[PDB]
């Protein structure tokens, strides 16, 4: 059969209509905000519809709080028996806090999730024991970690968001290691893991930084090597990078939110959000070391991890994909009881 010469103009029109196909197919274009200097391109790249949907998500709507009773009446420590951490609240405020906590942690299961159905005084369920340490942790976070959580504060809704198990929790060997026998060592990486943003980066970094105090500072403070300072660290850089993937995914931001890529090391070129993130790293490590990990004996086997360790919190446990938890909604002003230990 004769070969037909290619219709250049017709295929050019087809190319134009395919460009239209691409435009309708793959974007109304993302919305930009500029945080740094011009020409640097430090800022946020967000789809407007997706950002609006995440703000209008049910988890980002802090439940309405009832009017607070005047703190002048019979305390909860005399009316009730087993209230070691809430013995300074007026009984009316104690009941208001119980209702709020039920709305925040177990709205579906109701008051019976953390209480014996026929005895509110009995510390039978493990959930009551865990909730007491939850209350203590929230008070500790509000009183002692205002460098990070103020002025918004943290309540039971900040992590739990209306269900007993918070959405973003982690364990020690959260990503199953690969390799059979003497072959296939994945080295805690080389997998399509969502902890590393679906990259082949170290996906089990939360243990080194949010439970351990390992160094995230890989970049030297001098241009030339020192005699006692290490001259290597490319693989150690991958651990920091994976941790920064976790941080970026937990806040729904990019690297430029806290860094100038010209030098990831220089704080003077960094947005003031990097200072809040430093306090956040310290606070998350404190949370895991002091409250969430020592709760392992109180958990059933259904709640533990592959390594038998307690569930732990990270940047994404509170923020849930936003730069601030619930995008900055104040949650502690309505509940002064959760703002400081008694």
């Amino acid at each position: 059969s004769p070969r037909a010469p290619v219709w250049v103009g017709g295929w050019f029109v087809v190319g134009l209509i395919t460009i239209g196909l691409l435009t309708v197919m793959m974007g109304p274009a993302g919305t930009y905000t500029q945080s740094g200097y011009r020409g640097l391109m430090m800022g946020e790249v967000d789809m407007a519809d997706e950002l609006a949907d995440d703000m209008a998500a049910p988890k980002n709507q802090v439940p309405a709080a009832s009017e607070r009773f005047p703190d002048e009446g019979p305390l909860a420590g005399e009316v009730y028996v087993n209230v070691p951490v809430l013995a300074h609240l007026s009984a009316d405020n104690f009941n208001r806090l119980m209702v709020a906590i039920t709305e925040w942690v177990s709205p579906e299961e109701g008051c019976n999730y953390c209480h014996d159905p026929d005895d509110l005084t009995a510390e039978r369920p493990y959930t009551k024991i865990v909730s007491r340490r939850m209350l203590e942790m929230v008070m500790y976070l509000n009183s002692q970690w205002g460098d990070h959580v103020a002025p918004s504060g943290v309540t039971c809704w900040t992590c739990h968001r209306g269900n007993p198990v918070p959405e973003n929790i982690w364990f020690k060997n959260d990503d199953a290691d690969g390799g059979s026998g003497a072959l296939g060592n994945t080295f805690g990486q080389n997998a399509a893991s969502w902890d590393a943003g679906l990259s082949a980066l170290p996906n089990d970094v939360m243990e080194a930084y949010l439970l351990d105090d390992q160094n995230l500072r890989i970049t030297p403070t001098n241009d030339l090597p020192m005699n006692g300072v290490t001259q290597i660290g490319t693989k150690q850089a991958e651990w920091t990078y994976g941790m920064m993937f976790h941080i970026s995914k937990g806040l729904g931001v990019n690297c430029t939110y806290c860094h100038n890529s010209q030098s990831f090391r220089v704080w003077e070129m960094s947005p003031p959000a990097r200072v809040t993130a430093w306090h956040g790293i310290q606070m998350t490590r404190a949370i895991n070391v002091d409250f969430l990990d020592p709760l392992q004996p109180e958990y059933p086997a259904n709640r533990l991890g592959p390594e038998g360790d307690a569930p732990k919190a990270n940047c994404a446990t509170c923020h849930q994909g936003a730069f601030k938890p619930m995008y900055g909604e104040n949650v502690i002003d309505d509940y002064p009881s959760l703002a400081a230990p008694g």
Partner: protein, 53 residues
């Protein structure tokens, strides 16, 4: 181009033209289907409520 314009094929060779026309029509169909899929009211697979505000 009407039913009586039969000599258009003396200018546009059908063998080198219909393949491009078919490609154009297929791409247009894909474009419109994806345009309908990109809106909440006409994404028939997602099945959102008709009244979308």
């Amino acid at each position: 181009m009407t039913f009586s314009t039969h000599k258009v094929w003396l200018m546009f060779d059908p063998r080198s033209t219909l393949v491009a026309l078919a490609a154009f029509l297929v791409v247009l169909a894909l474009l419109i289907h994806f345009l309908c899929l990109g809106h909440d009211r006409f994404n028939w697979l997602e099945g959102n409520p008709a009244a979308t505000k």
